């Protein structure tokens, strides 16, 4: 699949807003993910002890992790589809070291859309959400293909 320049513009326009507060968006997204799909929390040995949203918000390590994740995702989105090089190491660590099923990538994609919808309604209307979903589907599709080449079905 391929996004048009118009769709990329919608994606990058709302992403520019997210970059005004990467740490904050990172926390909201992971808290949403962990609360909505608690099973994903078990994949993080560093955070699986967190019991409440309050503890999650107060975790300095979780906040730093969120920044690392969103920074990596932002770099991929800014490539506008030409992300082969960026995807290689990400696909290897998540398939081989962390063992993250494609299903879980769908869950975090849902969390990202939910947070952008809540925080940026004016810049995240129907068309913008469709563009973001398409960009994330492309990401998940290419990651899945790499998973297979690497020997991980998940
Ligand atoms: C938007 C998709 C995602 C991106 C861009 C992303 C990115 C990253 C990055 C850059 C790191 C640090 C470097 C590395 O280990 O490769 C990381 C670590 C990790 N990711 Fe992801 N990730 C994504 C989704 C997920 C999901 C859905 C899970 C599982 C629910 C997951 C689990 C992990 C784990 C367990 C680590 C190691 C954390 C640690 O122990 O420090 N990731 N991820």
Swiss-Prot record:
InterPro entries tied to this protein: Globin, Globin-like_sf, Myoglobin
Residue(s) carrying Phosphothreonine: 68
PROSITE patterns attached to this UniProt entry: GLOBIN
Annotated Gene3D superfamilies: 6.10.140.2100, 6.10.140.2110
Keyword line: Cytoplasm, Heme, Iron, Metal-binding, Muscle protein, Oxidoreductase, Oxygen transport, Phosphoprotein, Transport
Compartment annotation: Cytoplasm, Sarcoplasm
Enzyme Commission number: 1.7.-.-, 1.11.1.-
List of residues binding nitrite: 65
Entry-annotated residues carrying Phosphoserine: 4
DNA-binding recorded as keyword: no
Residues annotated for O2 binding in this entry: 65
Gene Ontology CC terms: extracellular exosome; sarcoplasm
Catalytic activity: Fe(III)-heme b-[protein] + nitric oxide + H2O = Fe(II)-heme b-[protein] + nitrite + 2 H(+); H2O2 + AH2 = A + 2 H2O
Major subcellular site: cytoplasm
Residues binding heme b: 94
GO MF annotation terms: heme binding; metal ion binding; nitrite reductase activity; oxygen binding; oxygen carrier activity; peroxidase activity
The Globin domain, residue ranges: 2-148
Entry's Gene Ontology BP terms: removal of superoxide radicals
Assembly and interaction partners: Monomeric.
Function: Monomeric heme protein which primary function is to store oxygen and facilitate its diffusion within muscle tissues. Reversibly binds oxygen through a pentacoordinated heme iron and enables its timely and efficient release as needed during periods of heightened demand. Depending on the oxidative conditions of tissues and cells, and in addition to its ability to bind oxygen, it also has a nitrite reductase activity whereby it regulates the production of bioactive nitric oxide.
Family: Belongs to the globin family.
Identification of the protein by name: Myoglobin
Organism: Physeter macrocephalus (Sperm whale)
Source organism phylogeny: Eukaryota, Metazoa, Chordata, Craniata, Vertebrata
Protein encoded by which gene: MB
């Amino acid at each position: 699949m391929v996004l048009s320049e118009g769709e990329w513009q919608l994606v990058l326009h709302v992403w520019a807003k997210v970059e005004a507060d990467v740490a904050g968006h990172g926390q909201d997204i992971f808290i949403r993910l962990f609360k909505s799909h608690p099973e994903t929390l078990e994949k993080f040995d560093r955070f699986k002890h967190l019991k409440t949203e309050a503890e999650m918000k107060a975790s300095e390590d979780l906040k730093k992790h969120g920044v690392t994740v969103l920074t990596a995702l932002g770099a991929i989105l800014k490539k506008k589809g030409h992300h082969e090089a960026e995807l290689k190491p990400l696909a290897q660590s998540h398939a081989t070291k962390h063992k993250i099923p494609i299903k879980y990538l769908e869950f975090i994609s849902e969390a990202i859309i939910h947070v952008l919808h809540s925080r940026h309604p004016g810049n995240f209307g129907a068309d913008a959400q469709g563009a973001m979903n398409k960009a994330l589907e492309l990401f998940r599709k290419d990651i899945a293909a790499k998973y297979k080449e690497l020997g991980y079905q998940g």
